[PDB]
Amino acid sequence: XXNXXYX
Amino acid sequence: XXNXXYX
Numbered sequence: 510x511x512n513x514x515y516x
Numbered sequence: 517x518x519n520x521x522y523x
Protein backbone atom coordinates (compact mmCIF):
# COMPACT_ATOMS: atom_id res chain seq x y z
CA UNK A 510 0.00 0.00 0.00
CA UNK A 511 1.49 3.35 1.06
CA ASN A 512 -0.36 5.30 -1.67
CA UNK A 513 -3.75 6.80 -0.93
CA UNK A 514 -6.77 7.25 -3.10
CA TYR A 515 -9.72 7.60 -3.17
CA UNK A 516 -10.84 5.82 -6.30
CA UNK B 517 -10.38 19.49 -3.39
CA UNK B 518 -12.44 16.46 -2.47
CA ASN B 519 -10.19 13.69 -3.82
CA UNK B 520 -7.31 12.55 -1.62
CA UNK B 521 -3.67 11.92 -2.41
CA TYR B 522 -0.88 11.55 -1.30
CA UNK B 523 1.36 12.36 -4.24
Ligand SMILES: *[C@@H]1O[C@H](CO)[C@@H](O)[C@H](O)[C@H]1O[C@H]1C[C@](C)(N)[C@H](O)[C@H](C)O1
Nearest residue numbers: 510511512513514515516519520521522
Ligand atom coordinates in the same frame (compact mmCIF):
# COMPACT_ATOMS: atom_id res chain seq x y z
C1 LIG C 1 -5.82 8.68 4.96
O1 LIG C 1 -4.55 9.22 5.19
C2 LIG C 1 -4.61 10.53 5.70
C3 LIG C 1 -3.16 11.00 5.76
O2 LIG C 1 -2.55 10.42 6.76
C4 LIG C 1 -5.33 10.51 7.09
O3 LIG C 1 -5.58 11.81 7.58
C5 LIG C 1 -6.72 9.87 6.93
O4 LIG C 1 -7.40 9.73 8.18
C6 LIG C 1 -6.59 8.53 6.26
O5 LIG C 1 -7.86 8.01 6.04
C7 LIG C 1 -8.22 6.77 6.95
C8 LIG C 1 -9.71 6.73 6.78
C9 LIG C 1 -10.05 5.96 5.51
C10 LIG C 1 -10.08 6.75 4.30
N1 LIG C 1 -11.49 5.46 5.72
C11 LIG C 1 -9.17 4.76 5.41
O6 LIG C 1 -9.57 4.05 6.67
C12 LIG C 1 -7.71 5.16 5.35
C13 LIG C 1 -6.73 4.02 5.18
O7 LIG C 1 -7.42 5.75 6.64
Ligand SMILES: *[C@@H]1O[C@H](CO)[C@@H](O)[C@H](O)[C@H]1O[C@H]1C[C@](C)(N)[C@H](O)[C@H](C)O1
Nearest residue numbers: 513514515516517518519520521522523
Ligand atom coordinates in the same frame (compact mmCIF):
# COMPACT_ATOMS: atom_id res chain seq x y z
C1 LIG D 1 -7.35 14.16 4.77
O1 LIG D 1 -5.95 14.29 4.81
C2 LIG D 1 -5.56 15.50 5.42
C3 LIG D 1 -4.05 15.66 5.22
O2 LIG D 1 -3.49 14.64 5.76
C4 LIG D 1 -5.95 15.44 6.93
O3 LIG D 1 -5.60 16.63 7.62
C5 LIG D 1 -7.47 15.26 7.02
O4 LIG D 1 -7.79 15.03 8.41
C6 LIG D 1 -7.89 14.00 6.20
O5 LIG D 1 -9.32 14.07 6.15
C7 LIG D 1 -9.86 13.16 6.84
C8 LIG D 1 -11.33 13.45 7.10
C9 LIG D 1 -12.16 13.19 5.85
C10 LIG D 1 -12.07 14.30 4.87
N1 LIG D 1 -13.61 13.13 6.27
C11 LIG D 1 -11.80 11.85 5.27
O6 LIG D 1 -12.22 10.82 6.22
C12 LIG D 1 -10.30 11.79 4.98
C13 LIG D 1 -9.88 10.41 4.42
O7 LIG D 1 -9.62 11.93 6.24
Ligand SMILES: [Cl-]
Nearest residue numbers: 513514515516
Ligand atom coordinates in the same frame (compact mmCIF):
# COMPACT_ATOMS: atom_id res chain seq x y z
CL1 LIG E 1 -10.04 3.98 -2.72
Ligand SMILES: [Cl-]
Nearest residue numbers: 514515519520
Ligand atom coordinates in the same frame (compact mmCIF):
# COMPACT_ATOMS: atom_id res chain seq x y z
CL1 LIG F 1 -13.28 8.40 4.66
Ligand SMILES: [Cl-]
Nearest residue numbers: 520521522523
Ligand atom coordinates in the same frame (compact mmCIF):
# COMPACT_ATOMS: atom_id res chain seq x y z
CL1 LIG G 1 -0.59 15.07 -1.70
